[PDB]
Design a protein around this nucleic acid. Structure first.
Ligand SMILES: O=C(O)CCC(=O)C(=O)O
Ligand SMILES: [Mn+2]
Length: 203
DNA sequence: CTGTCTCACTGCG
DNA sequence: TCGCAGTGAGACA
């Protein structure tokens, strides 16, 4: 291991942040991701929330071992077979953390108008206690942690941090039980961002 | 006086 | 421009 982590801690919050790649390498990986990743469209890009169906305000893709599935918000996604650039990132993350992953959800935000609404990654197909590894390329975007009982008896402070080009954010147990997260709209950001959340899914 | 939950939106302020 | 409130159409437990 031996890595410079920034620990994000609060009640029920255990997250870690480090920069894995310098600019030249991260640029190279980003350009490969832009060339190689295939995103879902049409019916595989619509979610149901609060009884309404929506096209997702971004693009999504999934890769991982054969036989696995991932379902959230009325949407079931099937993994495409691994490709070199994603295996490079998975293996690097695995070496630095000691954790293994069999699945990745890729989110692409074309600019600051693309975003993701607040949620917990608490799905049943997720291995109990398993961490989620979030790797980011392209534009730096703000990421928000919010405590679930602040929306509002327990006015617990929100946690904000920018996720930089080439960075890794580890979300350990029980972060996803007690805290919601989101990438809010940032109208000033004009460049695209590609995010990878490596997960461990049960068969 | 009092059920829990929501990866999304519009309508505010 | 950003953040918050209330969803809304049910499915739960
Ligand atoms: O865009 C991000 O950095 C986070 C994406 C996310 O929340 C997820 O993959 O579940
Ligand atoms: Mn998430």
């Amino acid at each position: 291991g031996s890595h410079s982590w920034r620990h994000i801690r609060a009640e029920g919050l255990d997250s870690s942040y480090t920069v894995l790649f310098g600019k030249a390498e991260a640029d190279e990986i980003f350009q490969e991701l832009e060339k190689e990743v295939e995103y879902f469209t049409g019916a595989l890009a619509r979610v149901q929330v609060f009884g309404k169906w929506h096209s997702v305000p971004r693009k999504q893709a999934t890769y991982g071992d054969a036989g696995l599935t991932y379902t959230f918000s009325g949407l079931t996604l099937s993994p495409k077979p691994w490709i070199p650039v994603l295996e490079r990132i998975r293996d690097h993350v695995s070496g630095v953390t000691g954790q293994t992953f069999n699945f990745v959800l890729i989110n692409r935000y074309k600019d600051g108008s693309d975003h993701i609404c607040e949620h917990r990654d608490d799905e049943r197909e997720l291995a109990p206690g398993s961490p989620i590894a979030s790797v980011s390329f392209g534009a730096s975007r703000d990421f928000v942690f919010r405590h679930k009982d602040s929306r509002p008896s327990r006015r617990v402070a929100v946690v904000r941090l920018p996720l930089a080009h080439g960075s890794l954010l580890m979300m350990n147990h029980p972060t996803n039980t007690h805290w919601y997260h989101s990438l809010p709209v940032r109208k000033k950001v004009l460049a695209p961002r590609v995010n990878l959340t490596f997960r461990k899914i049960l068969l």
